[model samples]
Target: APLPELLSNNGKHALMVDGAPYIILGSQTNNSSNYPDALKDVWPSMEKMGANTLSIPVAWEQIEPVEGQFDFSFVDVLLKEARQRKVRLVLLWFATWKNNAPHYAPAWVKLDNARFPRVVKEDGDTLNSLSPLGQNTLAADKKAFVELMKYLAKRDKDHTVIMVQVQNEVGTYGAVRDYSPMAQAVFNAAVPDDLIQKLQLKPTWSQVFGRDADEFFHAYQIARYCDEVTVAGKAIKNLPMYVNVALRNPFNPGLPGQYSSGGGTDNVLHIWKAAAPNIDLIAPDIYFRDYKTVSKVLELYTRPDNALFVAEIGNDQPFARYLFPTLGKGGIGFSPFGMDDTDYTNYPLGAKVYNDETIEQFAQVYRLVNPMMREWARLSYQGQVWGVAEPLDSTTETQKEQHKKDRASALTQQLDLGLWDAEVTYGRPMFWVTPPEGNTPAAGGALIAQLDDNEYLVTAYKARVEFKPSQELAGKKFMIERVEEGRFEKGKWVMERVWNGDQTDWGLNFTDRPHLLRVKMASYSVQ
Candidate 1:
């Protein structure tokens, strides 16, 4: 089997799994919590919660416990379980990198520093980083990763494991950049022309990179390190892989150089491209509240050259607002960091953390949109329509309502369309629409998609529906069909309702919750 093809015309959105738009409805499980026994319990729960994929770690230490001795027991278990549940997997390699710590380093490497040394600080002291210049460490990590890839290719070439993360939060702490004698020797050497050309910078790291020189150098070294790992892995099996970053805020620039290693910077991304060209994407680990502000960073990261995927996001209610708009705009995938928080002590739920009433709301939002991931990915690939909606201002609700009524009336009498005319044009031909707002009685909106020249799909939460057709649809008879209420079980759309006549005319009811509605325009009625 081969990796699933993600189709995108201009790299806006991607259509995956046979024209099914891809939305990453995923959860990040603990590194050690995804074993066979654990997954026996985890998969059922995930299936119930509507998760389509699982993100778990594959530790280098576990895979290569003793130098060249490799183990695939855990990997085999994870893939088999995921396939049994009809879900996908994203494997995070906890190799040379793990939470910015090399705890996953093999005992042989950690015990013998002469062969695989550690990075030093400017003060002539060694930091905790696996020496970026350590040939032994790099070679061992690369070899193990390549072997893992070969195993995956043989076992999961069908994309049972859809994607892999190169390293886990590759970065450094307590030190700005490597200051080891070897590091300094390399740093002082003229930067690579290939790097300079890729970033469109001057030749020297200091002169060309300017004030952010140290940051760029660090990113370059780390990227090169990870690139070696990627190169080896790709050699064995060609699959989509990415590196996740720990974000930095521009306003609160932490202690000048206190960021993650290989963390994405303008220069770092460039170096990564020039240094390790095979990595598929760079993702951000978001645990912040400022959706709009953070979204800007995400947009910046998502260049046409660098397509975007929300690999990890805050698992909170407010974050839900960021979904449709982000994906609608051009995002490849959206996944909250930790999905199974039932274990309150280890990973507390939002209710435990902030007394937030929105955890359930977040779950509801995910449940509503989870089924449409493939469809959304497809529409995005096609560059259909993208939009966002928020609550109407309470103070101006009356005015807005009156305005909407007038607009609808005009559209009806003048253009022969109704209030719901907006729904007739957005998304892909067979796509599902998610409500723009939540279920706050009269406080919700929808983002619709016009799949074909005439067919449309609409999704909403807690809002009334009205449909007005233009003269073109006046008597050109059509019937609105109700498909399955939930995700496809086998290969069938689990039919929940079959609406005709008035039920179709009034539109489906949501009852203060999210509803996925698909509207089909036909010349003759069926049933």
Candidate 2:
């Protein structure tokens, strides 16, 4: 009966759905797999992956084929099917800009350059991307978006749609900002007072941001347009909405036009935040396959003023482990892109093939947490969860080459949980006689949640988790009071068995099997 809303306490965040904290075990459909026919291929993948949420597109072209007339047929089908499949929906609005192209815009809009003009490049050439400064373009997009939201508010009384994605990787490719006379006029003008105050900037865009002025100006304009669209839609039905970024290299970022210029990359996040307050969050669409880049991107987006949501990630096995660190940093949701069996793969960006094995890599983690998702969500919101994944040895090495070598000298990841410290190691034997050599292909992750002062909820795969007394508890003998292997049902913990002896003798080791443990720790005087 209640709409989904994002709630943040202190620095932690949660997606409150149906009056409870919820973690989205999300699976995103392929780009073109929005129609009813293609949706048939989506559900099985969701089932296999144990995804509770489905991120699928609702195209502006398909929804509004005619000028003012709106068609809700495809949306109707999506809502019905999602409800039938028992999965929450996140509808992506593919309009104005879809990956810097007007492909998804209706033929009427895309063809009429005069009415909804294309972005003018620096060399006076028109790019395929639509100009964010087009008032007509904004008006049409807002009207269509509002109609969709109105339809959802009336028909989706059950609130099947938990969230809405404002646009798809929005920005220009050939130009940093629209170089049209109209755009240039505003660009040369003084920066808006609100943005100046919000970001502590001064004067005109060029005066405030010298070399980066064009990109910053474009980002401000794009964010403002998206904010207007979000504001209009929220008026009809206030669903939590976000925009996904087509990210640039976090470390050595190139010039504006090189990456998705004008998009809300980390550098322009302040602009996006100040310009688009109605849009709840700015999400990163991760495709990079290195520990350094991925981790850096996570740190950039996960802010106290923002809630981290991995709107799209590669469906590859390596990407699955990032979910640990994602949730570790108190992210609300993580969804891998191209997750459906629609017979399409983005090759280097995701898995090479769409098959069961690829799906299983993600399914394992979702299966382990799906039952206790609410529990994990609540714990994470309380700022008590920590997670770690096996780090890749090198970013330059080929995947095949990296997998061939066993990282015997790999470093263990440690988490300081106040009075306790958690040490997580991958490819470690059950006994201490053998040291930890990292996973062959660097595939393992561990999640630790502090349930109380000396108690924790722990789970891991292909890794070993051990807890030691912190400096605060030094000179005392650290001991495990109890370890209960349990699962949660309907927000209640049901213990299956107690793990002792071998389990405690060595650090709690987890193999490929899915296991959940409730560990109670104690420190006795070492007299």
Candidate 3:
């Protein structure tokens, strides 16, 4: 059988698994839940959330506890359990740098500083991060990663593991770049010719990039190291591989060292792509919750060259609504972090309590789309899809006052759909055009997929969607030809009912429950 691959056409992308487009409605387990004993608590939450994929770690320490000896106990057990549960897996390779620390590396590797040196900071302090300049470090990590890939290739012939993460957030904190003598040797040298040509720059790193020289230098080194590791592993068995990033703020991106300096943040994506061609994608591990930041990050990462994938997001109520917009933006996957019933939480970053309420937020959305996920992914790859979430900032104190001043204009949004315009209103009544107070906590969202020139497949939660003709067709007077409320079964639409009268009078109303509708439109000449 063939391995999982990413297929991109023009600007759209899809994860082709089993020779078909697949969308990953995924859940990520906590860091420590990879042990076989801890597997007891992981599956119930997955079943609850209706996730089709599980993103869990496979640490280097566990696999290569001693220097050369390897263990495949956990990998075998994980693959066996995943097959039994009928779920796909994304294995996280926790080596070299797990969120900028070498904690996940084997004791022999981390303790032997002479062989695997840590990054030296500007103030002459040794940071916990391993130096990308460490040849022995790279060789050791690469050797272990290759062994893991070989084992998976032999053991997972069924393709149970669809993707492998090369490293967890490969960068440094507390320092922008390694200031050790070893690193300074390369920094002072002229920029490599290949990089200079790729980026179209001058000779020296400092001369070409100036203030960003150190950051770019570190990014290139780290990305190159990762690429080497990826290349070696892929040579053993080619599976879609990627690196997860600890992102810097897209808006007020303060400084280099403030965030993970060399990771594939939005600013350094080009550097990573240039350095790591074998790596399939560079995905964001999102923790930012503000609407402005979240939306901007999505837009920045969704590119023709790169596929959009939210590898890890906060497992909170507010974060669930972002799934709609993520899919609408042509993302391949979305996974909320720390989704197991492990009795642990990341608090402010995610859900404080792993209760039904916190879990249901994602569960509801997953249940609505799980059946038609394939259809949606296929549509996204071949056609077009658009989605919107309720504006959360509208309820803030300042925005509340602004809304008070302009009630009629609040919480009403629109999407330009070529020949038609989709007007989405939150917390608005069904029968008239009036001010939308907006959903409490802003939980409303809607998705529109253009199935044909004058037809769409639509779904929403606690919102209304009204479609009107574009300005060119405004004088033609558009009419609703048909609206079938239905579900997708076995890759085909099965109509449950027809939405008419009040349903189309004001707009298509989607309440607390899920509603999937196929809407047809036509325009006739009017004097």
Candidate 4:
């Protein structure tokens, strides 16, 4: 089979699978839940969550427990099981810098820090993170990663593996920069021409990026080192590779070293780009509940060169609403991590409930687009899709009821797609709207994809969709021509029911029960 790649036009990007546009309705398994035996729990969740692709880890420790003794049993089992389940994989190389520590590094490497040096902090105390400035560490990581890719290329000639995560959140945690002599010397040297030019800076590193020069220098070194690994891996099998960042809240970018140090974070996106051009996507792992703050992160990564992919996010409900904006803004993919387990230990405090409710919420998202997912990719690529959701603390059920005439008016959450204005309403249960509540007057939101000039493919749960013709269409009005409730089976639309007399009377409204609807509209003069 042909390999998976990305295609883009104007500013939007799409994931191309085989020969067609593919949307990744994907969710990642927990870090330690990837073993084939324990994966008994994974496939069901994926099937339930309606995943077409899964992000899994192939750690360095599991593959190479002893030096030169590669054990691909784990890899083989996953490939076999995934093939049986008929799903694709995005293999995350937890070889080094997994969340800024060598926790996933092979036992041999961890045991012998003399050869592979760890980073020394400002106070001379060593961090668990390995130094990006270390030659031996880079060589070892490159070797292991290259071997893994080489094996996949040979075994997965069918192209079961689509993408690779080069390293998980590659940076230091406690320290901003390495204090070792080798690292110090590189920091003292003149900044690279490409980086400085791209950064639009002054002469030296310190003079150019003073006060924060340490983080910048560390960012540069880490990016370059990861680039070296990326280059070596692609040499073996050229799969689309990316590096995920441990991002700080864009609104409150606390301090230089507050979040993971020197990662491909928002502040250092350009630095990472200049250093690691070969890395296809610089992804963000979002855990925020606030919409505006998270939206900034999505916008930061959705560049012309870079495609927005939430490689890791909260699987909680607030995080679900983000799927709307990400895909609406033409993101390649969105995946919430720790999807396989019923436990909430892997998630943030109170964000994820300890039950199947979280799993089902993610599944509903998958099920909504599973049929027309490819259509979504094509639509987004063509700039025909727009998404919006209610902000956190936007409403309450009492207010939601009192203002029933103008649902979501007090909150007045608006969805502006430039030419068209969609003032959206808040959903039930949580911001990332789940199934629905009865008679609660809660209509979550929907993602609208333009099927034609006069038609749209809209998906939502418990809400009304009304359009106040664009400002350009100032003297005109929009009306519901038809609202068809239906689904796509085997990639073909099969309509269920058409709303006209009652349902269609109130714009494009979805009943308390939720699903997708194909909306057709026509314009009329103000008179």
Candidate 5:
């Protein structure tokens, strides 16, 4: 079976699956949805929601329940479901860590603190976190992970599983750093000269890094431990793998131990990258409600060194708008967490229905793009596709009182295509003559792909897209040669209707339904 990988094309980052580009329109299951029979109820929702891939947990406790014995019934059921549906899978390894605690660790392992010690704090109290320095624990994790991969290789030789998330939001929640005897001895000892040189610091932890020394130490140990596990797992299946983070707010990083302290976050990303070369990428789990926060998180993760994959975000409308930004920023994938659970009545984010509106919120984007996903992947990799949305509200007095400075930076609704520049707006929601009950003056959003010098594809779920040619074509009167309202048929654009005079005489806009408009243009100099 072919393994998935992150590849570079032109200057953009792309995720390649089975030797071809793939964009994961993924939706993740709830934490407790591991029950085999329970998953059957979620498939219809997934299908209706139009997700191509599903992310679910394959916990260590579930796999190796007994000390030497292993049960794989949960995995087997999911595998069968995946095989029957022909959908891709991103399996999460919820072993030693889940939400910075050992709650997910099997009882036998958790109870035996002597063999697998929990992290001890400076106050002499123990944390719920399992120590990354625990040799026995790391070895046990590697052993189980390797076995899982070996079984997967045999059972899913055809490759139903695309990638594996090594662990779930790992780090220490109770304390910043371990104060165990071994930990104190190492912390007091001079920092490794190799790491100091690499990170550009003094030889001793206290001498240079200051209050950050403890967190840095923990991050390094965790990364190294996970790297060992990944190294062992790859030895068996050679599949793509990654580690997810419990992010501390980049805007307001309160204190050292305020948030989960030793895992990969914005601050420790560099340390994780340095320590864990075997781990493919460091992903952020976004749960914040602020629009600015979401954008900032996405922007930070979308780096040249890192491939952006929104492993988890809120499963609601507020976070859905950023799907456009994810596409525009050359991201490989996007997944909304807690999609399988229909019982959101008790959920934090206010939602009126049990059926869940988030499904359709994401579905609208997926259903629009799924038909041309291959092309989207290729275009995104070429840096030809860009997306933007309406400006976030900034004049609200209540919000102004809450935060002094403006946080959310709204889309400029424009771009430079090298050959031309783009400007987006939404005036037409449907037909111009018979406008709906409430007209969308500027509803926001526009995704553009520059196909060639004279060819472009403009489609916005709620807005309109237009182009202004470059200096070379500035004096020239730009003339629209053709604008075809079309859809992709077998990866080829099939024109459904032509818009020239009455329809696009002003600007191009999609109706209530999803539509793709291919625009072709030519220029005549200063006529």
Candidate 6:
């Protein structure tokens, strides 16, 4: 199949797969684990987890171990394996920035700093950054990256590799920016017009970055290196490409920039845009506890100009909760880093292996909605509201008033309400209904539509209950049809129940946690 086309329409979002909304149910694989010998076993498990795409890194060191010699055995293996399994791939170019270190550089390059040059610190000491002014470093890295992209274009042109990240967290550590003599000379020079234009600021760094002009200049210098890498990659293959950043707290501006290299911080995203227009999006690697705060940072980058996709998130129970809101809010993808944890000793971030029953339960939830991402996007674009249930101030006195108030209030509220309002706040609707607490009529999750009048799809998880339509559907009759129960095994709906009349209550219970429930409704009459 051809690679899905992703386009930016309007100022709010990018439509993927020819305007069909796409949610990247993704996981990042270990570099060594994704190799030919190991990928056979690893890929299947990821596919079974309902992952539509996998993110794996391509190391410059591995691709070009020696000067000018290029090897693409690993790259070919990843693309071919992903195609065989019918999953999309996002290849991370671990060139200049891999975990804020240049360890991925070829041994020859690493051995000779005088020849390759390193970023200098303020005190003129060598910092752990690839000197931006090094001609040999840029030429070699760009050439290798271009080769990889060209290889993908030729080998996986059918879109086996849907997206490619330019570099992994491009930034410096233990120094705010590069301090090499060459770097200092470049930093002292007038800022590049492209950088100023991209950042929408004056040509000078002091005017452009305000008080932190030095940091901005350093970041821009590094970004120039990244821009060259992206240009090189784009020259080879014009696939959707992005760069990931290590985010810094917006409120706490005092936080040191020495932890990351380049201009990877959120503040410097514009610098990247100016520097690397070939790069489509600048993503964030989110691992912090504050999903709401972090999400705000994500929203900043997710403009119509820049599509948002979470490149890496921590693998935990909260990750499951984070998905609905992330996607609902128009994020293209969500990836839990360090998937396929066979070696718990080394790769602990892997989602801890669960029992068959546990995996099955989770899989059931995933399978139901994995096919509906485009559908969800279609509805969401039309202003549909989706989320789980919450307490109403007045349930009995007036259902309509309560429902309207709750809907309005919930839509306006921030995503801090724990798991109760997961989708409403996050942007993605909570598709799977978790078991309700106490005797709450089994809390029905809703996907409200903006297109059709009084049209919605409701899924029941823990409890079974009657459907109560609003005043708009007061006298109007409707029909409810059960879609499917288990996974989509053979394109068939394993019908479990049907409801008609004012309300149809069914007794449904699951001992093995929550199962899937889908109800499609159509009005028979208008009030």
Which prediction has more favorable TM-score, 2 or 4?
Answer: 2
Could you estimate the TM-score for every candidate? 0.77, 0.97, 0.97, 0.90, 0.91, 0.76
Considering TM-score, which of the candidate structures 3 and 5 is the better prediction for this target?
Answer: 3
lDDT of each: 0.62, 0.89, 0.89, 0.77, 0.77, 0.60
| Model 3 lDDT at residue 382 | 88
Candidate 1 residue-wise lDDT, 272-366, digit = tens: 76777777777767665553455566666777656677777776555655565556557766666555533532224222352234345455556
Task: List residue ranges in candidate 6 displaced over 4 A.
Answer: 1-4, 15-21, 198-200, 207-210, 250-254, 258-261, 345-365, 377-449, 457-527
Candidate 6: C-alpha RMSD after superposition: 7.5
Error of 1 at 59 (Å): 0.3
Give the per-residue lDDT digits (tens) of candidate 2, residues 123-174.
Answer: 8988999999999999999999999999998999888999999989999887
> Which residue pairs clash within candidate 2?
none
Candidate 4 residue-wise lDDT, 1-527, digit = tens: 77777666676677777877787778888888767787887888788777888999999998888888888998899999989999999999997799888889988897788898888988888888899988999999999998898898889998788889988988887789899888888788888898877867766678788887899888999999989998998888888888999998787888766788899888888888888888888888988766678878888888988888888888776676577778877887888888775353554622445457766766666666776787778778875788765444344568444535344343345555444555555443322323223222222456888777667788864455665555566577767677788887877889999967755554455433447788776777986
- Give the winner by TM-score: 1 or 5: 5
- Candidate 3 has a TM-score of 0.97
lDDT of 3 by residue, 205-310 (tens): 7888888889999999999999999999999988889889999999998888889999998888989888888888889888988878999999998889889999
Error of 4 at 158 (Å): 1.8
